[PDB]
């Protein structure tokens, strides 16, 4: 049994890394295998290492703010939330989860763009939901909700990560790198943009974005608009069409999620309960070919 306070230190000679996958601002994801001291057991591993050279200020504030999430949901997890397994500590930060053997669910969707299943499209939607619904009830806002950040165990089976990361990159007039990163503002809500208010609110509004990723086989929201636009035409009511294989019931939800009063966007327990009626009779609500 895990001590829930404790922190599990794994020694670099029982992880290996095999693979790049991929990167952000804050560090380099690896596939790797962990192969645990006395133990006969290897398990497939994601390894998130945190960038060397970002300002100490930004990576204690992202480490800190992983620990204290890491001891938040210790407690008791969620199936559709990605689970902290341990850190190895080198010259560098190695934060270590469970390998999702389909990756990013952007990818997932953008791969089989052809042969995807109606009911496996909805059946995500509801999990992601269920994902989001335990960080809320938990207290805790993703701040970068998208398809990118959504991981595929299996067909079966969605996580969330990348939870409680995204933030201003402290920087200095010469030490430390610079890349804070391009905003995802057609992820973000208007508040997001206009006042760097995030909530469980705005997550429901981005929520709608990775929705719209997701009918759409993972086409990119505002594809050729200029970022300066988004404001202006989001308060003029423009917003993503509906996906051709949804029926309005499916696009009313995403519209709701898109509302400038952030009061009148749906409750992510509401998603769950809407997602579910609509994965049990996916025939009713998503067609494709
Ligand atoms: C260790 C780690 C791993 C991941 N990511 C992956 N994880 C698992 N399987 C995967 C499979 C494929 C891909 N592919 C892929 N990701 C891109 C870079 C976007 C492009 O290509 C990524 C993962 C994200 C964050 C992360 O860091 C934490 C830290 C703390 N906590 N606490 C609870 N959860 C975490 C997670
Ligand atoms: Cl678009």
Redesign the pocket.
């Known amino acids: 049994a895990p001590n829930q306070a404790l922190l599990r230190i794994l020694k670099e000679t029982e992880l290996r890394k095999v693979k790049v ?4 601002a804050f560090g380099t ?1 690896y ?1 790797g295998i962990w192969i645990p001291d006395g133990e006969n057991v290897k398990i497939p591993v ?3 290492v945190l960038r060397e050279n970002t300002s100490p200020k930004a990576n204690k504030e992202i480490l800190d703010e ?1 620990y204290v ?2 001891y938040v ?1 210790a407690g008791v997890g969620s199936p559709y ?4 397994l341990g850190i190895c500590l080198t010259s560098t930060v190695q ?7 389909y ?2 669910l952007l ?1 997932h969707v953008r791969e089989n763009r052809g042969r995807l299943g109606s009911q496996d499209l909805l059946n995500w939607c509801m999990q992601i939901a269920k994902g989001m619904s335990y960080l809320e009830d938990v207290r805790l806002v993703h701040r970068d909700l998208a398809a ?2 959504v ?1 595929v165990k299996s067909p079966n089976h969605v996580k969330i ?2 939870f409680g990361l995204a933030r201003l990159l402290d920087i200095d007039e010469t030490e430390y790198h610079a890349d804070g990163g391009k905003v995802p503002i057609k992820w973000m809500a208007l508040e997001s943009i206009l006042r760097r208010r995030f909530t469980h609110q705005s997550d429901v509004w981005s929520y709608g974005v990775t929705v719209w990723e997701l009918m759409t086989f993972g086409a990119k929201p505002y594809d050729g608009i200029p970022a300066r636009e988004i404001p202006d035409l989001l308060e003029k009511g423009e917003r993503l069409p509906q996906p051709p294989i949804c029926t309005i019931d499916v696009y009313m939800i995403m519209v709701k999620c898109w509302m400038i009063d952030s009061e009148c966007r749906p409750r992510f327990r509401e998603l769950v309960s809407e997602f579910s009626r609509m994965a049990r009779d996916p025939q009713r609500f998503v067609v494709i070919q």
Do not use: Y
């Open positions: 996958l991929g990167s952000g994801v596939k994601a390894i998130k992983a999430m890491a949901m939330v990605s689970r902290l934060l270590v989860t469970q390998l999702m053997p990756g990013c990818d990118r950040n991981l990560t990348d």
